[PDB]
Design a protein around this ligand. Sequence first.
Ligand SMILES: *[C@@H]1O[C@@](F)(CO)[C@@H](O[C@H]2O[C@H](CO)[C@@H](O)[C@H](O)[C@H]2O)[C@H](O)[C@H]1O
Ligand code: B0D
Ligand code: B0D
Ligand code: CA
Ligand code: CL
Length: 496
Amino acid sequence: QYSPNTQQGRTSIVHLFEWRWVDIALECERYLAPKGFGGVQVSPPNENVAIYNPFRPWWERYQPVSYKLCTRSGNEDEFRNMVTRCNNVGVRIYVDAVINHMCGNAVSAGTSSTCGSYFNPGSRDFPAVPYSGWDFNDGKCKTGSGDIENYNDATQVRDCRLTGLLDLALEKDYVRSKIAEYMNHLIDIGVAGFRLDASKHMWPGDIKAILDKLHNLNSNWFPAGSKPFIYQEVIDLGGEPIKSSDYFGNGRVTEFKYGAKLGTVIRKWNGEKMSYLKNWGEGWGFVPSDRALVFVDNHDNQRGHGAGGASILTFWDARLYKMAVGFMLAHPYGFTRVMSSYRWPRQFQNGNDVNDWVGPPNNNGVIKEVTINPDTTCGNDWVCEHRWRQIRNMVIFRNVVDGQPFTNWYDNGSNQVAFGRGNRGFIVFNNDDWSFSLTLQTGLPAGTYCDVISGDKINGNCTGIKIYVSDDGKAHFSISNSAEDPFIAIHAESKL
Ligand SMILES: *[C@@H]1O[C@@](F)(CO)[C@@H](O[C@H]2O[C@H](CO)[C@@H](O)[C@H](O)[C@H]2O)[C@H](O)[C@H]1O
Ligand SMILES: OC[C@]1(F)O[C@H](F)[C@H](O)[C@@H](O)[C@@H]1O
Ligand SMILES: OC[C@]1(F)O[C@H](F)[C@H](O)[C@@H](O)[C@@H]1O
Ligand SMILES: [Ca+2]
Ligand SMILES: [Cl-]
């Protein structure tokens, strides 16, 4: 459960949020494989409710109608084509599994679904699965509203409806089997693992029972006995009865404290400073590294829809965002997930974005293809953060230093810090309101290294900043607080 199942040397996965299967397949071959990306988290591939009010919101995909591989991202044929092509290039696919619930209980009955399947939330009828009233927790939930009302009561959080979403009776073998049937279908197709959506709303024991029915990965691409990578979406910040540790027996868990705290630190909120990141990781109360799935932002909290709050950094905060992602990718703690999003008309009113529901770039509801600009950036309103030189090069940095220890830490007692990874890499950050000019011990072999943030190493030459490491491993670093990117990163493969 705990191993990502990525190719040796590939240490990160990217969330291609709302991307079409055909576009992902191409991205795997043209960019992800050549650039060393480990895998891709795809949006829910199962049929969901088609919501027109608002117009096709991104969250409609988290309201299942059936387990048919039929969505705005493509059909089963397109999905299989993508998994196959990506796997053939050594890039894994991880499915966002929405198994805790079906659609909202108040959703109108009919065929307003991505595959035309009929469903009736009111009567608990989902014939395409099939599911009936006997498969939901209507009788198990003890709240007066039938929905989750108090998170201080661990029982209702699992047996009641999350904001009205019909809650599946996961204790029933029939329900467990139907979900396993869906997941096994995906595994046999070639997926390497899953993100278990709303895991906090599922009993650890129920998840385990379901995972116990899962197949080993497809033996045509993976070694015998390979188990699907499992990372459970559990939002666990401050004081709550439910702890993400309650799910360690099933696989990894999303560490939402990671992005929340990193955001507050880089934003320098309430006295926080980068010098405090010296003991980053378990020292900050985070889950063990081998059970952590980390990220700066996710599809939910990048639009104030999830845990983290206003401290979460996103592509909207480009400069600080690159620094946060850079620190994450350089630091050894956990398995890293990079976010890839689309632009939307953010409309802030009284502190809240009233357009936080807007779905992916589209034409009359049809998701737009991802176009690639001559400079390798994306068009059609796709942000493609994973294609940003500063982020892509850090994804590679993590690969190059894989296994190397956290060492040679330095800090000015404020927001100027630096550290290395064994003798394979070194990174320096300046988040202070003044320039940083100092000679530091890099632990790297003597030579000339290309800074992979400001530039690239191309045919024996650096396109950006150049760093010179002496025989004693020391090197001079100069970063103005006015620099486009106030951080420098160099590694074994950026050496001339
Ligand atoms: C997991 O599935 C969710 F449904 C619940 O965590 C997603 O939540 C989004 O969709 C819901 C149904 O449309 C909305 O009610 C909810 O406000 C919205 O955040 C969640 O994003 C997924 O990670
Ligand atoms: O994750 C599941 C669990 F909480 O911890 C361990 F996995 C146990 O084996 C299992 O029976 C229990 O329900
Ligand atoms: O341990 C059993 C379980 F996983 O967690 C709780 F005990 C629930 O009451 C039960 O229905 C569920 O199957
Ligand atoms: Ca539940
Ligand atoms: Cl997540």
